[PDB]
Nucleic acid binder design. Sequence first.
DNA 1: TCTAGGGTCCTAGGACCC
DNA 2: GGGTCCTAGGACCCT
Length: 342
Amino acid sequence: GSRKIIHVDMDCFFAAVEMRDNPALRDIPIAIGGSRERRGVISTANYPARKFGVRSAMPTGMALKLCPHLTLLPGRFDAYKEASNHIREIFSRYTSRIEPLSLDEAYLDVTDSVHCHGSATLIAQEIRQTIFNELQLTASAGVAPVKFLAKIASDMNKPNGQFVITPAEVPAFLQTLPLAKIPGVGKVSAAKLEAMGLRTCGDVQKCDLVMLLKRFGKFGRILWERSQGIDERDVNSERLRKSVGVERTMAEDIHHWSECEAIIERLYPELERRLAKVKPDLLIARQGVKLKFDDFQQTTQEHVWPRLNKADLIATARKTWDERRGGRGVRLVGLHVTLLDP
DNA sequence: TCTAGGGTCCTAGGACCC
DNA sequence: GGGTCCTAGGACCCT
Ligand SMILES: [Mg+2]
Ligand SMILES: [Mg+2]
């Protein structure tokens, strides 16, 4: 009953699309990200820029210190959504068992496939090709018996490559696998685990489940499972969107309510336009606001509300402003909607 | 160098329900 | 005391 799971992951997705559409960008360092003047960060970069140390989520001022000739791009999201829709349709030629995890990646369960003699390796290869055909972008892939190993595997032969982990290969692979490689083990978790002497899945294998449960709750059960290759999560294919948000970081912190209210006036029409694409009648479960202060503490206040409404968002932002600001500057204002359950 | 914007999921206290 | 809803915060994911 061993399953075949593929994780397909586009290479330097946003940047790859910009280079296809502007070949002048191919061999110089480029990045999609907000300018230093907009206090932006890097969304992604191409390999010429990564050579200098440019990475996703890095402050753009830092990316420019590392790479002074970096070419900053604003982003063409409809072009990325178009490429996303296209690779998802390519996935559909092979199976309906597709769980997209973001624009540029997905899990596929090809256990019950008989497309390439049932070879998940050859299916992944055929998918990466033809994606390169048809779209002129490259993808990488991982093949494993469970989700998280497949997702780790797709990173190991990036770019334009793939990696296959068989059941017989799982124990040696786990033994020295850093815990931070596990999707969902982030910086904070890895430091907590490091400070108790737990760096790798092999370290966690020597641990008692009861101890992991005491110290990490349900997450400790995830750690215990993942450190043994155990990951029973099914490829879904029926996941639905649950929220939509629109937020903006200003170039300068704002200090007056009038400024905050003016930001909301520009944010609201965008939130409405995006909700209306998915819920034309604007009916929702909750709506609310977000403020982030100059000390980077952030607060949200949100409440049951039946239908997108600008004045209530302004009013709610006003309360948040007056009540939780305590004289600090505000760097970000955000609007938010929680979608109805079905 | 100085910190985005799009999201999902988990936790947790009091309210409310029984 | 036990479910479940409401709400806020935070870790983490993607580019
Ligand atoms: Mg990618
Ligand atoms: Mg990806």
